[PDB]
Amino acid sequence: GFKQDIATLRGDLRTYAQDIFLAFLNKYPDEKRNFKNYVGKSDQELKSMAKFGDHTEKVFNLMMEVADRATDCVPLASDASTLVQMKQHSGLTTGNFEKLFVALVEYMRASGQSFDSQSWDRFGKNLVSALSSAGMK
Amino acid sequence: GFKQDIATLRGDLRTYAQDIFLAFLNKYPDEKRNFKNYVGKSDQELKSMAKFGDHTEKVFNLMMEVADRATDCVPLASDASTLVQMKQHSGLTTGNFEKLFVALVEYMRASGQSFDSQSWDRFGKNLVSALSSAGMK
Numbered sequence: 505g506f507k508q509d510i511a512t513l514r515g516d517l518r519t520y521a522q523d524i525f526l527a528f529l530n531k532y533p534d535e536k537r538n539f540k541n542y543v544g545k546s547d548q549e550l551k552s553m554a555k556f557g558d559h560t561e562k563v564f565n566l567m568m569e570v571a572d573r574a575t576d577c578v579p580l581a582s583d584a585s586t587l588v589q590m591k592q593h594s595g596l597t598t599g600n601f602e603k604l605f606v607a608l609v610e611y612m613r614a615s616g617q618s619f620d621s622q623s624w625d626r627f628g629k630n631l632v633s634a635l636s637s638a639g640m641k
Numbered sequence: 642g643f644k645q646d647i648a649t650l651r652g653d654l655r656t657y658a659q660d661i662f663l664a665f666l667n668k669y670p671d672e673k674r675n676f677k678n679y680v681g682k683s684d685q686e687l688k689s690m691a692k693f694g695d696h697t698e699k700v701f702n703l704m705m706e707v708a709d710r711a712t713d714c715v716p717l718a719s720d721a722s723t724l725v726q727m728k729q730h731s732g733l734t735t736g737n738f739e740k741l742f743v744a745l746v747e748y749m750r751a752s753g754q755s756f757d758s759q760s761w762d763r764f765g766k767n768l769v770s771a772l773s774s775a776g777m778k
């Protein structure tokens with residue numbers, strides 16, 4: 505289930521983080537507007553850039569901490585507040601986060617592994633609702 | 642304390658993992674016989690190799706999970722058993738792990754950050770004992 509999935513993701517976090525983020529950017533190419541330094545690069549080019557791997561791993565590390573602190577896939581209000589108030593997230597809307605979790609859930613469903621995709625879907629929905637309550641437009 | 646230290650390390654894990662592993666290899670140069678592609682290379686040359694960064698980060702991915710699942714710095718017997726039974730650890734003895742944690746604790750003591758170095762020293766001791774109980778010579 506959810507707790508084992510956090511352990512699975514964390515065990516190879518840079519690889520999963522890159523693969524899922526690439527699935528997100530390829531499914532929703534307009535999202536690269538928020539990441540101008542990734543424009544014009546294939547998946548393997550981005551996976552060779554230490555700054556891409558560093559960024560995505562740090563994102564997914566924070567995601568895993570928020571996931572681990574959740575109860576029954578409900579994140580803490582204070583973690584949503586952290587995500588809304590980060591300077592790097594100013595101007596973002598909840599649709600950006602919604603799209604990231606759609607890509608993550610579809611990645612898990614298409615993997616040959618027994619991820620608890622329903623729990624990640626509910627986690628993403630609950631986090632988006634919390635982000636909105638915490639002030640994200 | 643110990644739990645916060647896990648979060649600190651995970652927040653910049655590729656850097657910490659490489660730097661701590663280098664401190665281990667430089668304190669105990671004989672240990673490089675287990676890592677023959679790292680012989681004859683300076684620190685900067687190792688940090689340019691994706692193999693070195695990928696290996697050390699996957700090691701620390703798992704080490705942080707083992708630390709995270711511990712209670713009062715006592716690791717799970719299941720985690721010790723996994724570490725003993727991993728094919729990559731065939732022939733290793735608990736002294737190899739002792740030295741890794743000595744280097745880790747010394748790195749923390751020298752860092753200027755408020756790492757809980759005594760808890761990592763205790764964690765290392767308890768892990769060595771649990772490896773022995775799980776059959777490591």
Ligand code: HEM
Nearest residue numbers: 535538539558559562563564566567592593596600601604
């Ligand atoms: C649960 C979801 C997310 C988490 C946990 C998260 C976490 C983070 C973290 C930890 C950083 C700092 C990275 C670093 O210091 O290297 C960061 C930066 C950033 N995040 Fe997020 N993020 C999430 C979702 C998103 C989404 C959906 C977008 C846009 C579609 C976004 C846009 C950005 C941008 C633009 C930066 C700065 C990038 C840079 O300076 O290179 N984040 N995020």
Ligand code: HEM
Nearest residue numbers: 672675676695696699700701703704729730733737738741
């Ligand atoms: C708590 C401590 C440790 C953990 C969590 C750990 C974990 C791991 C992991 C996850 C791998 C696979 C990583 C990869 O794909 O390259 C690995 C491989 C390996 N480990 Fe460890 N390890 C630990 C301590 C040690 C020590 C102290 C030694 C030897 C002094 C050692 C020797 C090796 C070797 C030789 C490999 C194969 C590396 C390769 O083929 O690239 N490990 N270990």
